[PDB]
């Protein structure tokens, strides 16, 4: 419930970061200068050994230390908004456990990096005979995945169309919980996330020719279902119809890479605008989005320094 007591530590973590000058100096680096600059950074608190996987685990531990306490330090409404912020790794581990159950891979075969649930709940739900029983063994009190997998669990046990319907139920429950609270800043970002998810599904599925209304979800405002059908057809004109919306520079780009980069830059500019509500959760969302953008850019830059990639090779990823 404390939107300011956790925000004090959030501003403390946002004050401690490696700036863009640390990357512009590392723009000419060959993973030794980059290993020192990451060893000098906050990732140097987790810089154990050497290599691309060691820097990967160091950046993962640095992000899980700087942002992983946001699931803690709040109770009630602020804890609910924080749990419905970093739903990427939790739903990733949930889909990975579903893949290991429905495919036959071992639970120790899955890595299952840190989302929002502990390792014990995921180990209890990985060996589970029933899908409702697995969603109840993984039922956290603030888990909307517990309210989505159990809702879509009256289709099958572990299937593919059931998994797509459960992901649609997770996105719909996320948007419904975003509308279901006093979220003037958070429901906008959640609806932008759902609409950009549908738009990126249409952009990567450009040329699929499938049913757009079956692919279109409910909650979006940046486009319409007719624009969704025009984008399901091989036409970036509906993608060029995004003018005045948060997709400012996104027009006439039909490639999945260009459209996904435009959606990512628009979402970065949108979540960066959360600083108008600093005593709520928009400052913490802006700090989490900036840490995520800088950490993914640092992962791309660590790979670029370990591979000796050019400045023109990291140019489209050094924009955000």
């Amino acid at each position: 419930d404390d939107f300011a007591y956790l925000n004090a530590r959030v501003r403390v973590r946002r004050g401690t970061l490696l700036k863009e000058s640390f990357f512009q100096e590392a723009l000419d680096l060959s993973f030794a200068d980059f290993l020192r600059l990451l060893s000098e950074t906050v990732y140097g608190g987790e810089l154990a050994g050497q290599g691309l996987p060691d820097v990967d685990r160091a950046v993962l531990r640095t992000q899980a230390k700087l942002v992983g306490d946001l699931p803690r330090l709040v109770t009630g409404e602020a804890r609910e908004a924080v749990r419905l912020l970093l739903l990427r790794n939790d739903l990733h581990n949930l889909q990975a456990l579903l893949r290991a159950k429905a495919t036959g891979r071992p639970f120790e075969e899955v890595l299952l990096l840190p989302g929002t649930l502990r390792e014990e709940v995921w180990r209890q739900a990985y060996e589970a005979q029933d899908p409702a029983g697995m969603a109840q063994v993984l039922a956290v009190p603030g888990h909307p995945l517990a309210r989505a997998l159990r809702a879509v669990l009256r289709e099958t046990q572990d299937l593919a169309r059931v998994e797509a319907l459960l992901a649609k139920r997770f996105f719909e429950d996320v948007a419904k919980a975003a509308k279901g609270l006093d979220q003037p800043a958070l429901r906008d970002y959640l609806a932008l996330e759902v609409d950009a998810e549908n738009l990126r599904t249409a952009f990567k599925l450009q040329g699929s020719g499938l049913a757009p209304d079956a692919f279109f979800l409910k909650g979006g405002r940046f486009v319409d279902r007719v624009r969704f059908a025009r984008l399901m057809e091989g036409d970036y004109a509906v993608l060029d119809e995004l003018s005045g919306t948060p997709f400012s520079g996104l027009s006439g780009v039909r490639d999945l890479k260009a459209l996904e980069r435009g959606l990512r830059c628009v979402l970065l500019k949108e979540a960066k605008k959360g600083v108008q509500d600093p005593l709520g959760v928009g400052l913490v969302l802006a700090y989490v989005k900036e840490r995520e953008w800088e950490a993914v850019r640092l992962r791309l830059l660590a790979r670029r320094a370990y591979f000796g990639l050019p400045r023109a090779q990291v140019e489209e990823e050094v924009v955000c």
């Binding site: 925000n7 004090a8 530590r9 501003r11 403390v12 946002r14 004050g15 005593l279």
Partner: protein, 73 residues
């Protein structure tokens, strides 16, 4: 002083209590925001304490009105 002295003290006291209530009402959000800003860094505390101490003129006017009510009696 009859109805003057008994009720004038009550009129000063309601003013002082409501002025302190409004001062603490400002001071809650001001101190929470200043504590968050000082927890961000211990370098911009000069403006933080300035914004914290800026909410005092209401209590100052209440105490001045209390002094004026004491002098008028």
């Amino acid at each position: 002083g009859g109805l003057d002295r008994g009720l004038i003290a009550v009129g000063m006291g309601l003013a002082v209590g409501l002025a302190a209530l409004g001062t603490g009402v400002a001071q809650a959000r001001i101190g929470a925001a200043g504590v968050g800003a000082i927890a961000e860094d211990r370098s911009n505390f000069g403006t933080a304490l300035i914004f914290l101490l800026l909410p005092e003129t209401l209590v100052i006017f209440g105490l001045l009105i209390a002094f004026i009510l004491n002098g008028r009696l």
